Design a protein around this ligand. Structure first.
Ligand code: HEM
Ligand code: HEM
Ligand SMILES: Cc1cc(N)nc(C#CCN2CCC(F)(F)CC2)c1
Ligand SMILES: Cc1cc(N)nc(C#CCN2CCC(F)(F)CC2)c1
Ligand SMILES: C[C@H](O)[C@H](O)[C@H]1CNc2nc(N)[nH]c(=O)c2N1
Ligand SMILES: C[C@H](O)[C@H](O)[C@H]1CNc2nc(N)[nH]c(=O)c2N1
Ligand SMILES: [Zn+2]
Lengths: 410, 411
């Protein structure tokens, strides 16, 4: 019950005690492992205080003031506030701590070595979608930083009754539209076809290109969501070329610089922040492997291999594998040439191993989801493939939440 | 109770009922997932329910559940257990058991073949020399001059745990590894400890880079004995590249026959501690893991050097580029010498069809995503996008400790 994880490439054995503080459930049982399932499918006054207590206990422990005057005072004060308002408000310090630890606890994120260097934007005073748009534009500009990317989160007001939810309807602040074609195929990003529809059904005028930046669909206080166009001068994009193949240009590929997840829910001390867009910088494989080469996304492997004049008759020629490497060389080359921050999968996974070692040494563990941490190409030549990992749920946390169009009383 | 798994590339959803027949524990709990952990004698007491469960499965599969042959066999096994404390499988039951242990091996991507398995009954074997004869016949049968055939050879079951049959090799055919005084390793670093045991037992080592290890065979709990597999039975493939003529000069070869010999076969509560089984290679086992793991032959550097890639920063993906060329060479060489091999694209696509069929006809297919997804190019194979449920069914193949850690030496 004091579990060991082994690295099978280096024989390093770490001991995990942090999991004993895990709280929520994994979906697994002693009879069945669900480690590869993508999604293992308002607080009452009594639910809320233990959640608040556990959070404040670890916050005051983290500032070397556990069991202090300020500690017990703050617990008393929040306890009174929950008895009164049936909720409470975080101090700025507690909100910053909670957001940084939500990232620290994200067992699916390989980039967590950066977790303590997060810029937190308190948007809890926001009241309208126009205000949300303003807050989001400032986030995008701050985070983009002319290509020297900086991690950031913007936190809108917390859920109250569940009818007054703040939501960003986009899955990412910056994503490309998807359109169904008259014949049968799909133009642009197939992952966003339904959302691209709801933008049109709400009033958007689509350029119907392959890489049209979608508008924002912002929902304040539970009202109907409103469309806004992010100023193009704030959307940094990178044209994709190859350092060897001059014909790579003509494929006409580009991607955006800023990965900014906007559809998740941030839980801190039992409080639920349904609108909390956060952003970092890309690992190259997210774009070159998944966005570009998933059969259900832009699905370009066919195109690139033809231009490389590869033997596409036999799978055993590994023509897909060859094109895949070249595509991912170009993505990294393109961002690096334009001085936009990006990290390759070798550097990122090497950094995550160092981070695991830090977290085991200074925290007693690091929840990690191997299925998500290992990159989708060249898995076993990255160090994380050989690293045993324990997955468990710690709070503060980022969680998935239903898409709001399946929920909103329009 | 029912469970669903979704393929996120095709939106195909399958429903698992077979997990209900699972009883062994996974290592996970409601509060921790140990899905990436590599490793998470019986008495008459517990043995008859294990036998009954297996015999119920067996007679269901032959459409004879509840028949008089079924009931008499249960009676016969019951009496044999209480009077002798163990029991003997019929030939039919052993064949069924071995095939179903393969069918239940959740880490194996090649299970579409599970029903096509040649079972060699070696339960009459008594000495290490007899084990050697049985293993030579298996190697020759399975190799079939390059037209590989799956096979398993089953040696006598455990009795009191003091008379175990064991194959001390982890694979029947594997290359030696030697630690040099300068700290480097010649040959296969995975096999240094076993090589040292063989040398200590009297093996005269050629001390080269691709030396086929001798068999080290333990019969009836006795001290193990060394044997050299006849070299004419060891089919090997010299590795060359279809475009790069310098690749042959790296001096690489590999053997044709993957034959795991260190696992334990459990059938109906009986434990077969010596049960070597063999199929054919998926290309990435050799080209990615054997050649390119840092802890194995580790050829990424010298290949990338001769390819003259930009090796000064990893963001050139020089490692990824050399890795693909190595794996093209492995597949090219095997096909050119007409030795059976399967690339990871073909193998994972067959597995998905297998898995869907198993959900249809059997109600499930336990599968370990961590092991099923190939170690290169993961998400461009279909298993990456496939949700899987992992659970333990019997009959099964299990890990067991290395015999040198447990053996009491006779001297
Ligand atoms: C700064 C550089 C960062 C890098 C290089 C990085 C890398 C990654 C990658 C590659 C993934 C997998 C994405 C996918 O496969 O869909 C991921 C997931 C995730 N990241 Fe990070 N990330 C970074 C910053 C952040 C930040 C700032 C946060 C929050 C404050 C965060 C929270 C998460 C979460 C919650 C997930 C899981 C997403 C999901 O379940 O869909 N990341 N990250
Ligand atoms: C017929 C062609 C076969 C192919 C292409 C195949 C493929 C594979 C591969 C690629 C692995 C992963 C091995 C590793 O990464 O170390 C594996 C594991 C495994 N295979 Fe198959 N296999 C085949 C036949 C068989 C047979 C005949 C048996 C038993 C009768 C079997 C039982 C297993 C087991 C038990 C494992 C798990 C090994 C472990 O846990 O270390 N396989 N197989
Ligand atoms: C902050 C951050 C940094 C980074 N490098 N990657 C990511 C991601 C992602 C993938 N995202 C795609 C859209 C979604 F499915 F809705 C959520 C998951 C996030
Ligand atoms: C029958 C078969 C076919 C195939 N293609 N691969 C395998 C394998 C393996 C895994 N192997 C790794 C090294 C070992 F631990 F010593 C034995 C287990 C087995
Ligand atoms: C079914 C499987 O869980 C699914 O394809 C997962 C696998 N691993 C992943 N890993 C990352 N980083 N991102 C993903 O979307 C997925 N998808
Ligand atoms: C720690 C981790 O489970 C370990 O490296 C696993 C990963 N998946 C694997 N998958 C296969 N097929 N073979 C392996 O040896 C491993 N090793
Ligand atoms: Zn699990």
């Amino acid at each position: 019950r004091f579990l060991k994880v082994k690295n099978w490439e280096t024989d390093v054995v770490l001991t995990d005690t942090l999991h004993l503080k895990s709280t929520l459930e994994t979906g697994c049982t002693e009879h069945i492992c669900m480690g590869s399932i993508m999604l293992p499918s308002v607080r009452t006054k009594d639910q809320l205080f233990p959640l608040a207590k556990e959070f404040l206990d670890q916050y005051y422990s983290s500032i070397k003031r556990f069991g202090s005057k300020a500690h017990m005072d703050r617990l008393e004060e929040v306890n009174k506030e929950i008895e009164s308002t049936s909720t409470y408000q975080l101090k700025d310090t507690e909100l910053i701590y909670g957001a940084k630890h939500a990232w620290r606890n994200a067992s699916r994120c390989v980039g967590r070595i950066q977790w303590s260097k997060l810029q937190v934007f308190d948007a809890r005073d926001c009241t309208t979608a126009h205000g949300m748009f303003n807050y989001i534009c400032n986030h995008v500009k701050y985070a983009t930083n002319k290509g020297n990317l900086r991690s950031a989160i913007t936190i809108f007001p917390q859920r109250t009754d569940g009818k007054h939810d703040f939501r960003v309807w986009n899955s990412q602040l910056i994503r490309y539209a998807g359109y169904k074609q008259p014949d049968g195929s799909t133009l642009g990003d197939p992952a966003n076809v339904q959302f691209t529809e709801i933008c049109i059904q709400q009033g958007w005028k689509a350029p119907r290109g392959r890489f049209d930046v979608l508008p924002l669909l912002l929902q304040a206080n539970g009202n109907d969501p409103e469309l806004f166009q992010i100023p193009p001068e704030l959307v940094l994009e990178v044209p994709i070329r190859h350092p060897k193949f001059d014909w790579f240009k003509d494929l006409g590929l580009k991607w955006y610089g800023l990965p900014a997840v906007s559809n998740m829910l941030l839980e801190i001390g039992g409080l639920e922040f349904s609108a909390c867009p956060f952003s970092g910088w890309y690992m190259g494989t997210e774009i070159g492997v998944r966005d570009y080469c998933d059969n259900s996304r832009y699905n370009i492997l066919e195109e690139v291999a033809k231009k490389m004049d590869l033997d596409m008759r036999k799978t055993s020629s590994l023509w897909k594998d060859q094109a895949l490497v070249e595509i991912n060389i170009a993505v990294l080359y393109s961002f690096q040439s334009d001085k936009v921050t990006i990290v390759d999968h070798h550097s990122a996974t090497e950094s995550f191993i160092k981070h695991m070692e830090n977290e085991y040494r200074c925290r007693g563990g690091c929840p990690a989801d191997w299925v998500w941490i290992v990159p989708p190409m060249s898995g076993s030549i990255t160090p994380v493939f050989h690293q045993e990992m324990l997955n468990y749920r710690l709070t503060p946390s980022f969680e998935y939440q239903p898409d709001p169009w399946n929920t909103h009383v329009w």
